[PDB]
Design an enzyme around this catalytic site. Structure first.
Site, PDB file in Angstrom:
ATOM      1  N   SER A  45      -4.176  -6.984  -4.606  1.00 58.84           N
ATOM      2  CA  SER A  45      -3.221  -6.745  -5.680  1.00 58.84           C
ATOM      3  C   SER A  45      -2.531  -8.001  -6.194  1.00 58.84           C
ATOM      4  O   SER A  45      -1.816  -7.905  -7.200  1.00 58.84           O
ATOM      5  CB  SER A  45      -2.154  -5.748  -5.249  1.00 58.84           C
ATOM      6  OG  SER A  45      -2.709  -4.466  -5.002  1.00 58.84           O
ATOM      7  N   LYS A  48      -2.862  -8.566  -9.874  1.00 58.37           N
ATOM      8  CA  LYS A  48      -2.071  -7.850 -10.868  1.00 58.37           C
ATOM      9  C   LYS A  48      -1.219  -8.802 -11.697  1.00 58.37           C
ATOM     10  O   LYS A  48      -0.908  -8.500 -12.855  1.00 58.37           O
ATOM     11  CB  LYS A  48      -1.244  -6.744 -10.198  1.00 58.37           C
ATOM     12  CG  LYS A  48      -2.146  -5.643  -9.623  1.00 58.37           C
ATOM     13  CD  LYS A  48      -1.455  -4.569  -8.786  1.00 58.37           C
ATOM     14  CE  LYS A  48      -2.500  -3.535  -8.355  1.00 58.37           C
ATOM     15  NZ  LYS A  48      -2.203  -2.792  -7.106  1.00 58.37           N
ATOM     16  N   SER A 105       3.087  -2.310  -7.219  1.00 58.95           N
ATOM     17  CA  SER A 105       1.658  -2.423  -6.963  1.00 58.95           C
ATOM     18  C   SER A 105       0.887  -1.173  -7.397  1.00 58.95           C
ATOM     19  O   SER A 105      -0.182  -0.879  -6.864  1.00 58.95           O
ATOM     20  CB  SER A 105       1.337  -2.813  -5.515  1.00 58.95           C
ATOM     21  OG  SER A 105       0.275  -3.762  -5.525  1.00 58.95           O
ATOM     22  N   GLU A 141      -9.515  -1.183 -10.134  1.00 58.04           N
ATOM     23  CA  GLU A 141      -8.974  -0.475  -8.984  1.00 58.04           C
ATOM     24  C   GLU A 141      -9.701   0.856  -8.802  1.00 58.04           C
ATOM     25  O   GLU A 141      -9.974   1.550  -9.782  1.00 58.04           O
ATOM     26  CB  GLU A 141      -7.489  -0.180  -9.180  1.00 58.04           C
ATOM     27  CG  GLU A 141      -6.605  -1.404  -9.290  1.00 58.04           C
ATOM     28  CD  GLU A 141      -6.462  -2.180  -7.999  1.00 58.04           C
ATOM     29  OE1 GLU A 141      -7.012  -1.789  -6.948  1.00 58.04           O
ATOM     30  OE2 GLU A 141      -5.752  -3.234  -8.066  1.00 58.04           O
ATOM     31  N   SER A 212      -2.873  -6.250  -0.346  1.00 59.48           N
ATOM     32  CA  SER A 212      -3.503  -5.834   0.897  1.00 59.48           C
ATOM     33  C   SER A 212      -4.868  -5.229   0.571  1.00 59.48           C
ATOM     34  O   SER A 212      -5.078  -4.693  -0.521  1.00 59.48           O
ATOM     35  CB  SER A 212      -2.646  -4.770   1.621  1.00 59.48           C
ATOM     36  OG  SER A 212      -1.294  -5.172   1.806  1.00 59.48           O
TER      37      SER A 212
HETATM   38  B1  LIG Z   1      -2.576  -3.965  -3.659  1.00 60.10           B
HETATM   39  O1  LIG Z   1      -3.382  -4.940  -2.790  1.00 60.10           O
HETATM   40  O2  LIG Z   1      -1.161  -4.082  -3.211  1.00 60.10           O
HETATM   41  C1  LIG Z   1      -0.705  -2.936  -2.511  1.00 60.10           C
HETATM   42  C2  LIG Z   1      -0.325  -3.297  -1.087  1.00 60.10           C
HETATM   43  C3  LIG Z   1       0.610  -4.500  -1.085  1.00 60.10           C
HETATM   44  O3  LIG Z   1       1.588  -4.437  -1.858  1.00 60.10           O
HETATM   45  O4  LIG Z   1       0.354  -5.467  -0.334  1.00 60.10           O
HETATM   46  C4  LIG Z   1      -1.852  -1.962  -2.576  1.00 60.10           C
HETATM   47  C5  LIG Z   1      -1.868  -0.668  -2.064  1.00 60.10           C
HETATM   48  C6  LIG Z   1      -2.997   0.115  -2.235  1.00 60.10           C
HETATM   49  C7  LIG Z   1      -4.100  -0.389  -2.908  1.00 60.10           C
HETATM   50  C8  LIG Z   1      -4.077  -1.679  -3.412  1.00 60.10           C
HETATM   51  C9  LIG Z   1      -2.949  -2.494  -3.251  1.00 60.10           C
END
Ligand SMILES: *[B@@]1([O])O[C]([C]C([O])=O)C2=[C][C]=[C][C]=C21
Ligand SMILES: [Cl-]
Ligand SMILES: [Cl-]
Length: 263
Positions: A45, A48, A105, A141, A212
């Protein structure tokens, strides 16, 4: 002092059992601290930020863009949509989706940002236009988070992401209104207290984006305003050998403490 920091990062990586990537840029003296900073890591994420920035860039020529209404359908839901799930069968603005992606996120929000600039290859072309050759957003995603070792999809390097984050938040990639909007959004992040922030003094001001994914991938990228100092940019990326490894946010906090001690 610099040898000591390198030894401490190597020892942290060894203890962690995984692979650690760090890039700190200190704008006080234009110095950097680098550890595996040219290796690729799955962004998860943290990507993003680039997607929101691409929307902000598009908005520089399109004054109704941030206000544009986007329908949230059941078919838009993916695996993690804490904000969008509250708006099913209504609309959200692109500004609201940007805030949700950056501050919670939200994965639906990310997919809408991706879609509205033209897809992953368009987000990637935006990075290229800024001078970042390394960033690649391959997928949408939720699949962009698989983080398989050796897989270059959806990766960047710590050096590249630190340099680009500097440009986005402190430099001139975005116009003044848009840069300020990105910084305000990142400062309002709700997800980062256990990551870079946990390794810094309580008084320091942070805008960050966590991520994550698979293989226990645990990431954070931040712009940091230490008390009475010029800002820092810090990227901490971390990934592990086991497919189902659990997150290690403590490793990111430890890395942040190591590279900022003395500042
Ligand atoms: B993305 O990597 O960020 C959040 C988790 C985080 O904030 O570290 C998340 C949660 C679920 C799917 C993708 C992501
Ligand atoms: Cl750049
Ligand atoms: Cl403190």
């Amino acid at each position: 002092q610099t040898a000591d920091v390198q030894q401490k990062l190597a020892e942290l990586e060894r203890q962690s059992g995984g692979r650690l990537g760090v890039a700190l840029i200190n704008t006080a003296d234009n110095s950097q601290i680098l550890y595996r900073a040219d290796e690729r890591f799955a962004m998860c994420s943290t990507s993003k930020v680039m997607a929101a920035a691409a929307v902000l860039k598009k908005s520089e020529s399109e004054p109704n863009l941030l206000n544009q209404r986007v329908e949230i359908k059941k078919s838009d839901l993916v695996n993690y949509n804490p904000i969008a799930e509250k708006h099913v069968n209504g609309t959200m603005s692109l500004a609201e989706l940007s805030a949700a992606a950056l501050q919670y996120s939200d994965n639906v929000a990310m997919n809408k940002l991706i879609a509205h600039v033209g897809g992953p290859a368009s987000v990637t072309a935006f990075a290229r236009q800024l001078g970042d050759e390394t960033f690649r957003l391959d997928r949408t995603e939720p699949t962009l988070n698989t983080a398989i070792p050796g897989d270059p999809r959806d990766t960047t390097s710590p050096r590249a992401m630190a340099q680009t984050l500097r440009n986005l938040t402190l430099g001139k990639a975005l116009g003044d209104s848009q840069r300020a909007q990105l910084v305000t959004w990142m400062k309002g992040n709700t997800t980062g207290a256990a990551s870079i922030q946990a390794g810094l003094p309580a008084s320091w001001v942070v805008g960050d984006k966590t991520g994550s994914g698979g293989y226990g991938t645990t990431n954070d990228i931040a712009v940091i305003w230490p008390k009475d100092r010029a800002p820092l940019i810090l990227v901490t990326y971390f990934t592990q050998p086991q497919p189902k490894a659990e997150s290690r946010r403590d490793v990111l906090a430890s890395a942040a403490k190591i590279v900022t001690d003395g500042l």
